[PDB]
Design a protein around this ligand. Structure first.
Ligand SMILES: *C[C@@](C)(O)[C@](*)(O)[C@H](Cc1ccccc1)NC(=O)[C@H](Cc1ccc(OC)cc1)NC(=O)[C@H](C)NC(=O)CN1CCOCC1
Ligand SMILES: *C[C@@](C)(O)[C@](*)(O)[C@H](Cc1ccccc1)NC(=O)[C@H](Cc1ccc(OC)cc1)NC(=O)[C@H](C)NC(=O)CN1CCOCC1
Ligand SMILES: *C[C@@](C)(O)[C@](*)(O)[C@H](Cc1ccccc1)NC(=O)[C@H](Cc1ccc(OC)cc1)NC(=O)[C@H](C)NC(=O)CN1CCOCC1
Ligand SMILES: [Mg+2]
Ligand SMILES: [Mg+2]
Ligand SMILES: [Mg+2]
Ligand SMILES: [Mg+2]
Lengths: 222, 233, 196, 204, 226, 250, 196, 233
């Protein structure tokens, strides 16, 4: 029997700061126990200060991104070059995914950018289009390894103020872009150590009011 | 949904400093029967692109005709068809990738794995893969089937990353490709000795070599191997 | 696999390809499928590699114990011991074995034991996946009482064709010659046999 | 149906400087129903600690079995079993049920009383030993524990630091798993004192 | 797993990677897949981890007892015969795939054995998920009349192909060299090409970060006197 | 063709004696002298190679046997009974211990298992007791060096030094005078050689004496390098040459 | 079935056995499997009898309409029409067809269309269940530019062997000779071909 | 439970006035492959019985050995083994029927259909069938496999009921058997031209004919049959 789905591995990670957001993904692409590529980008500048990744089955991921990019293009044509806000992108992506509710896009989608007050925004989707805004999300193969670390280190979960018995939580702070990139780099090194489908390279897209910047780092190639 | 009947095995390929090389053997298998011994699975498109195809041969012949018709259609009302508006490797690839994914999305795939090798207008090397699922990827080396498991490890010792491509000559790359084809003949039960090889260079253009053979094979150590364990004679 | 055993004037010759498969992967390209169960009784193995080894090891043991007690076993006796194992364990085995031997009394003999564990005494026998492609060739080209050089050529040409058409056969062609003179091991590489 | 995730639970162990730590959650459920909030998964035989995750009937059975075997060991040898030896005994005992296995993820922790060397080990359900210098994880949130441990851990932590590190690894892994949590216990083990602490954690 | 065996002038060398996996997760980054059967008979293991450990320990135990009984140094063909008969009896359910090698009074030997009980002889062999990546290297670079140094190089290169190109294999390379007339040398972590880079940050928490409900001293000692 | 002897052949007589055990001990008295001496850093066990013909190659008959890499045995009494006990003792060390715990048994526990086998031959149906007494010398990490005697009954006792067989009364007395708790292994070997000369009639050289030690780890006897914690067998059989060297300073 | 088409100096010859099976029962022992789609374009049929008939009837219709409008179709054109039907309906058909024809320009041509609907131009082709047994024989004995009498003998000997070994082949051997001279139908009975 | 591998097709037989005739072809098929061409499937037991066997050939060879051993064992301590205490067809049959039914009852059948033909001491004709299920029956004509469908209708035109047996000569019966074998060669895809035939007569004893061939075959009408319908040439 023909199986229309495959699993191309990889992992992705979105974190929001006060006036920026990052979307990171490894650059490895796999099927079964083979490496297809050590550098196949997975995180894309979509226009209007929005970055997007759709991790899982890469063919579905590429189709989805391609359709959203096209959605942005037609949003400009039909609404007088108006900027597509991140909340509006999110809702549009829900309709793209839910359109294929009974033959789903086999991906976990994350978008990142700035909301309409200039604050960092991360939106996160399931394969059929349910979504939520968060400070914080990992998706893909190593999501189960990475998310709990992010719960601990971004939202300070289970951390209390020392000497308060256990009755005052560690207070929530926004993190600087330098502190976020550290958590991203450590998150991916940890995932590379323990997950066979994660490795090769890390590409981070950072979004500020000034635009989209890229950073790249080597990861272990085994 | 179908099942592949007459099939072609690996297509292997790599980038080198000035271009790309791609190769595939000349066999059309019918299950375990080595049915057809003169099948060309490298199909040139213009003088800048070679499409290497593995998997179902009937679907390969369909793709061959799609490409031939694409050249015909691009020439229509196009006085620059042999110049600035000639078909590029990237145009040919995106067309095939579009088709493959549409066909998988209707549960009626073209049962193939495809590598499009070539050189763009600006001299850039092009090397990208697409298969029956519409999955696409690019890398300094690419191979389908058994080639992914045995050729890639060998070809990656030569070009392990993007920075190794300018350091690699056409002589070194062709030798690695020719060696990889021998290893596949040793080890793949649905391979053949006879193969075709194509080089697309930014200076010298398209060179297409037919009727190559795997040569310089080590079999001599076989005479010393006796039994499966304790048998001495 | 492609295996055959051919009786001729001075004795019998066994031939085999050298390919072992694990699906489409060639696990061993220089396999030795001709195995000795007694000084001048040999067998060709096809089917499961594990099953045919286990059987051949047991037969070798039975015939060594036969030898100690009753002297040299006949080729028919060796075939009977293979058959007993193959027949009684037919539900659990995938073994197609050709047994070939040389007596001074009976000269060269060939017995084939296919899947079910029946025995068939024949002037020559072919077996394995690759044998299907040479039934026509072998029937047309076999004669009785061939010379050693003729029989070597008949087998070389036959397995050449089996190898050409069967993906599950390949590598070198090994042969074992069984006469009064003794035991001669031959090998033939692709560069000789392909161009035939 | 899948016996390794009917009841839920997790165990993690870590080495520090002249110390080891081993921790577990307290939940026992029947799939979605939480039944007990007091089901400990860590046992000791003299100074050797054993954590067991998986099917709870097999957790209990194996504890009783290793209590039996180590009691007899001690009577015959006239000394307490050491962690390296107990690790081999766990492996032997699991592998003798090779084709009808105990559905468990055991974890050994302790300090060799002669050499002073900290020791941890993990196993699969049929006895393959994973002897690690850094950490061992087991249970329904093992993916989550691997991620926490691989990022949070650093070598040569002092007992009171190691406690914070292992507790944060456990707590945050448990919170991303439906079948783990409901309480937690952390044993900090030095050569001749062992402190046991119950953690305050989210009760959902 | 990637395991290999390479025959050379005066002996045989075997090598292995050091990764074990549980699904797509790496359970152990530094396992020992080179199992000692006897002092000069070693084998590299692939397949179900517990099965390979149990099968080599059992056959090693029985080889030791056989060696004592016969007053002879054990032969590789005996290790092979016992392994094949055991594995065949269990009809593939004991999933051990082994490269069996060593030196004995008869000479130097190199075999492979599959889970169903089939064995092979060779000058070079590979098993496991990375066996195709390893065999590509072995088929390209092997020659007859190899020196000890050339064989260690070839074997570790073949493992490296597995480490880099096969997702089933990673971390380090282990080697064991068995030369005629000499002690077998086991080279644990012969290569270490995958050391984890320095982390960006320390995650050591402030003491008191974790909320505690209760403490107590655990009694580990025996029952006390007086 | 059936074994119908399912009843004991060793039974209590009216005086309370187990005759077959006593008679086994008498066979042990007729046997050649063997002895063991415990030192601070080792143990020595020794006996005479009483050859039956001079055409016999006495090298091929090993009275002193390795049981584990740190445990050795010698006997007095019936040699064939010893040989099968050595086979079973080697095996039980694997089946009842190494295959469970991954390490060789401590001396007292291996002794305990041999003792068991010998006790079963004293009570089970259709068998006679073993006609040997063993001296088992060994080392283990938590007990250090030890020396045990095992008798036909299955009883075992730990010794500082002892002797069994033919001239054991005289040899035990000789050892009571010479033994102290500060002996170094070489001094124990020297005493073993002196004690054994009293009980030997004929030739007294490295070809007529069999002597082994439990001493330091011998890494050169291991057969492989690369594992730090495997340091080698503590059991070593002294060669003919090594014995003769110690007989010149005697 | 056993079918083959062989090009030679003066043209091409098609050959076939005459057995139609319904399980182990022979529904028709004098079947005609060689069918005319145009004056000098013929095909051999193997696989489902219903499927290959339906296809051949459609092709005959397409080529008769081609003829009316555009003149005589080439053998390649006839093969293209078979291929289109076999390829596009691959899920629903079990048809292995050999197409053979004679032009004055191109002389004799042979195209084989196996199960998937691929096309392969060849000097000679074999197909059907019985063809497996003669791959070896046919490869060894085929030469280009044979005479008519040589080609008739090559096919007679080849299908003789296919019939001997394949239970699903038998009866008479039919042949169709395609040259500039015209169209010659031959038949060969068991009593001639068995004793070869 | 197994599946038959190497197989023999029909065994056909009938009674006539003074005895019984039985025949079977000399083929051992291997699926559709006609693998072995000199297989004897009629096995005489003494000079009064022939056991004809179809189905699995490995199980046939087992039955052959059971019968050979039955003769050996009946001779033991039996001075009348060549006379009044010789094995009868009815004794041989009941033995085989017992075995077949025991084997089916343990879910491990002998995958065969068997006809035991012979003449009893008192001159009575014996003809009885048994198969892998242990089902047994007797009739003036008996046939296995395709023989049941095609041979029986022809043989029953000669002997349609018990009263027709004294009216039927050995010449008439043999001709009917030989004709039936030709019809089976025409129509059974797993049959052969070469066959063996045996007659057990109460006066002349056992006659066993080897290397018979089907002859006088009508193929000539084949040259007039063209196409499948409308094709004229
Ligand atoms: C044609 C060929 C090459 O297959 C021929 O018959 C070989 C004979 C041979 C090979 C080596 C030594 C001696 C003789 N056979 C093989 O190469 C077999 C093919 C085969 C596999 C499995 C079965 O199972 C019914 C039949 C034939 N190869 C093997 O046995 C290899 C070593 N093992 C496996 O592929 C593992 N198998 C897979 C199927 O399940 C059982 C375990
Ligand atoms: C590359 C690899 C990882 O496959 C190589 O073969 C490893 C060899 C090895 C040898 C000795 C010690 C350690 C590692 N093998 C493994 O790591 C195996 C891989 C494996 C998993 C599952 C199956 O299932 C049939 C076969 C092989 N890993 C394990 O055995 C792990 C530790 N245990 C399990 O996955 C649980 N087992 C799986 C088999 O069924 C019983 C439960
Ligand atoms: C080798 C042989 C004899 O089979 C050869 O291929 C024949 C070609 C032929 C026959 C007559 C005219 C022209 C060409 N084919 C047959 O004899 C076929 C065999 C066959 C049956 C069914 C299938 O199905 C995929 C493939 C091959 N015989 C028939 O088609 C007969 C007339 N019909 C049936 O047996 C009924 N079938 C049974 C299976 O389900 C479909 C209906
Ligand atoms: Mg990785
Ligand atoms: Mg081949
Ligand atoms: Mg929870
Ligand atoms: Mg809850």
């Amino acid at each position: 029997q023909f199986n229309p789905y495959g699993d191309n591995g990889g992992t992705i990670l979105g974190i929001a700061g006060e006036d920026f957001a990052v979307l990171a993904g490894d650059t490895r692409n796999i099927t079964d126990y083979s490496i297809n590529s050590r550098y196949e980008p997975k995180v894309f500048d979509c226009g209007d200060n929005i970055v997007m990744s759709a991790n899982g089955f890469a063919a579905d991921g590429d189709a989805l991104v391609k359709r959203f990019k096209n959605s942005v293009k037609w949003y400009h044509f039909d609404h007088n070059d108006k900027k597509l806000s991140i909340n509006s992108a999110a809702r549009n992506i829900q309709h793209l995914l839910y359109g294929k509710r009974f033959f789903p896009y086999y991906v976990h989608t994350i978008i990142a950018g700035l909301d309409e007050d200039g604050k960092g925004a991360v939106y996160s989707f399931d394969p059929v289009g349910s979504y939520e805004r968060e400070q914080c999300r990992a998706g893909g193969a190593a999501a189960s390894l990475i998310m709990p670390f992010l719960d601990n280190q971004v939202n300070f979960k289970n951390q209390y103020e020392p000497g308060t018995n256990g009755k005052v939580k560690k207070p929530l702070k926004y993190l600087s872009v330098e502190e976020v990139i550290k958590l991203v780099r450590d998150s991916f090194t940890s995932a590379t150590e323990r997950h066979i489908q994660v490795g090769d390279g890390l590409e981070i897209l950072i979004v500020t009011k000034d635009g989209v910047r890229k950073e790249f780092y080597e990861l272990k190639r085994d | 949904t179908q099942q592949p009947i007459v099939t072609g095995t690996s297509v292997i390929s790599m980038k080198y400093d000035n271009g790309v090389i791609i190769a595939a053997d000349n066999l059309g298998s019918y299950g375990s029967l080595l049915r057809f011994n003169g099948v060309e699975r490298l199909i040139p498109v213009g003088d800048n692109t070679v499409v290497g195809i593995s998997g179902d041969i009937s679907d390969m012949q369909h793709i061959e005709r799609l490409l031939k018709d694409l050249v015909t259609e691009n020439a229509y009302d196009n006085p620059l068809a042999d110049a600035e508006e000639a078909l590029e490797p990237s145009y040919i690839f995106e067309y095939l990738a579009t088709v493959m994914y549409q066909r998988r999305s209707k549960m009626n795939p073209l049962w193939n794995a495809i590598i499009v090798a070539g050189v763009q207008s600006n001299g850039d090397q092009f090397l990208r893969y697409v298969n029956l699922l519409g999955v696409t990827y690019s890398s300094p080396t690419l191979a389908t089937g058994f080639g992914a498991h045995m050729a890639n490890p060998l070809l990656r010792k030569v070009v392990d990353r993007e920075s190794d491509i300018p350091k690699t000559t056409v002589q070194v790359a062709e030798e690695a490709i020719v060696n990889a084809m021998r290893v596949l003949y040793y080890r793949d039960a649905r391979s053949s000795r006879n193969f075709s090889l194509a080089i697309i260079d930014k200076n010298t253009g398209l060179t297409f070599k037919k009727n190559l053979q795997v040569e310089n094979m080590k079999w001599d150590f076989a005479k010393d191997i006796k039994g499966y364990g304790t048998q001495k004679i | 696999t492609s295996i055959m055993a051919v009786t001729f004037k001075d004795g019998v010759i066994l031939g085999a390809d050298s390919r072992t498969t694990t699906g489409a992967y060639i696990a061993n390209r220089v396999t030795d499928k001709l195995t000795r169960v007694h000084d001048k009784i040999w067998c060709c193995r096809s089917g499961s590699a594990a099953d045919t080894q286990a059987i051949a090891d047991i037969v070798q043991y039975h015939l060594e114990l036969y030898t100690s007690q009753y002297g040299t076993p006949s080729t028919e006796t060796a075939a009977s011991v293979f058959k007993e194992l193959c027949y009684e364990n037919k539900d659990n085995l995938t073994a197609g074995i050709i047994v070939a031997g040389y007596d001074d009394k009976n000269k060269g003999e060939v017995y084939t034991i296919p899947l079910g564990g029946s025995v068939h005494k024949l002037p020559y026998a072919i077996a394995g996946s690759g044998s299907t492609f040479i039934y026509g060739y072998c029937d047309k080209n076999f004669r009785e009482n061939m010379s050693k050089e003729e029989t070597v050529d008949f087998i070389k040409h036959s397995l050449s064709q089996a190898i050409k058409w069967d993906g599950s056969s390949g590598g070198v062609i090994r042969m074992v010659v069984l006469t009064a003179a003794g035991v001669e091991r031959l090998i033939f590489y692709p560069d000789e046999y392909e161009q035939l | 149906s899948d016996p390794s995730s009917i009841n839920g639970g997790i165990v993690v162990a870590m080495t520090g400087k002249d110390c080891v730590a081993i921790a577990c959650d307290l939940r026992l459920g029947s799939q979605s129903l939480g039944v007990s909030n007091k089901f400990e998964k860590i046992f000791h035989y003299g100074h050797v600690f054993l954590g067991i995750t998986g099917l709870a009937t097999d957790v209990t059975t194996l504890n009783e079995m290793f209590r039996y075997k180590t009691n007899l060991y001690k009577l015959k040898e006239e000394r307490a079993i050491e962690p390296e030896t107990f690790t081999q005994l766990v492996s032997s005992s699991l592998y003798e049920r090779r084709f009808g296995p105990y559905f468990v993820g055991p974890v050994v922790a302790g300090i060799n009383s002669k050499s002073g060397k900290p020791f941890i080990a993990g196993f699969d359900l049929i006895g393959c030993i994973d002897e690690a210098k850094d950490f061992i994880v087991s249970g329904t949130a093992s993916d989550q524990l691997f991620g926490m441990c691989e990022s949070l851990y650093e070598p040569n932590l002092e007992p009171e630091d190691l406690f914070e590190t292992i507790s944060q690894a456990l707590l945050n892994a448990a919170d991303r798993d439906a079948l783990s949590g409901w309480g937690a216990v952390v044993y900090i083990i030095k050569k001749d004192e062992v402190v046991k602490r119950y953690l305050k954690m989210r009760q959902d | 797993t990637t395991i290999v065996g390479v025959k050379f002038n005066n002996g045989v060398v075997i090598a292995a990677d050091t990764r074990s996996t549980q699904g797509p997760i790496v359970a152990d980054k530094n396992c020992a897949k080179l199992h000692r059967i006897s002092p000069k008979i070693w084998c590299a293991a692939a397949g179900t981890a517990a099965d390979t450990e149990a099968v080599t320990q059992l056959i090693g135990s029985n080889i030791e007892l056989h060696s004592l009984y016969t007053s002879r140094e054990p032969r590789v063909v005996s290790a092979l015969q016992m392994l094949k008969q055991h594995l065949f009896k269990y009809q593939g359910h004991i999933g051990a795939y082994l490269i069996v090698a060593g030196v004995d009074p008869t000479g130097s030997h190199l075999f492979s054995i599959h889970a169903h009980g089939s064995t092979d002889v060779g000058y070079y062999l590979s098993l496991g998920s990375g066996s195709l990546a390893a065999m590509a290297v072995l088929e390209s670079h092997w020659k007859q009349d190899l020196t000890k140094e050339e064989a260690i190089k070839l074997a570790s290169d073949a493992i490296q192909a597995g480490i880099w190109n096969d997702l089933g294999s990673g971390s380090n390379v282990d080697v064991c060299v068995m030369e005629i007339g000499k002690d077998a040398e086991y080279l644990r972590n012969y290569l270490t090409p995958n050391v984890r880079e320095e982390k960006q940050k320390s995650y050591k928490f402030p003491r008191g970060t974790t909320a505690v409900l209760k403490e107590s001293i655990v009694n580990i000692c025996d029952i006390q006197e007086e | 063709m059936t074994d119908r002897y399912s009843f004991s052949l060793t039974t209590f007589s009216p005086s309370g004696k187990l005759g077959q055990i006593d008679y086994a001990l008498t066979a042990v008295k007729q046997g050649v002298t063997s002895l063991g001496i415990k030192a601070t850093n080792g143990v020595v066990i020794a006996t005479e190679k009483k050859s039956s013909s001079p055409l016999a190659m006495s090298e091929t008959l090993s009275k002193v046997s390795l049981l584990t890499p740190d445990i050795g045995a010698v006997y007095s009494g019936m040699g064939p009974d010893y040989r099968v006990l050595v086979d079973k003792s080697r095996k039980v060390a694997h089946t009842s211990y190494k295959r469970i715990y991954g390490e060789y048994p401590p001396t007292k526990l291996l002794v305990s298992e041999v003792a068991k086998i010998m006790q079963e031959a004293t009570q089970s149906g259709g068998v006679r007791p073993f006609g040997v007494s063993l001296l088992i010398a060994g080392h283990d990490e938590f007990n250090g060096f030890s020396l045990y005697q095992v008798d036909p009954s299955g009883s075992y006792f730990p010794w500082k030094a002892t002797a069994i067989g033919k001239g054991s009364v005289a040899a035990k007395t000789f050892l009571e005078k010479r033994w102290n708790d500060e002996l170094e292994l070489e001094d124990a070997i020297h005493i073993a050689l002196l004690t054994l000369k009293e009980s030997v009639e004929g030739e007294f050289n490295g070809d007529t004496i069999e002597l082994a030690i439990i001493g330091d780890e011998n890494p050169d006897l291991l057969g492989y390098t690369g594992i730090p914690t495997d340091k080698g067998p503590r059991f070593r059989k002294l060669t003919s040459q090594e014995i003769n060297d110690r007989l010149e300073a005697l």
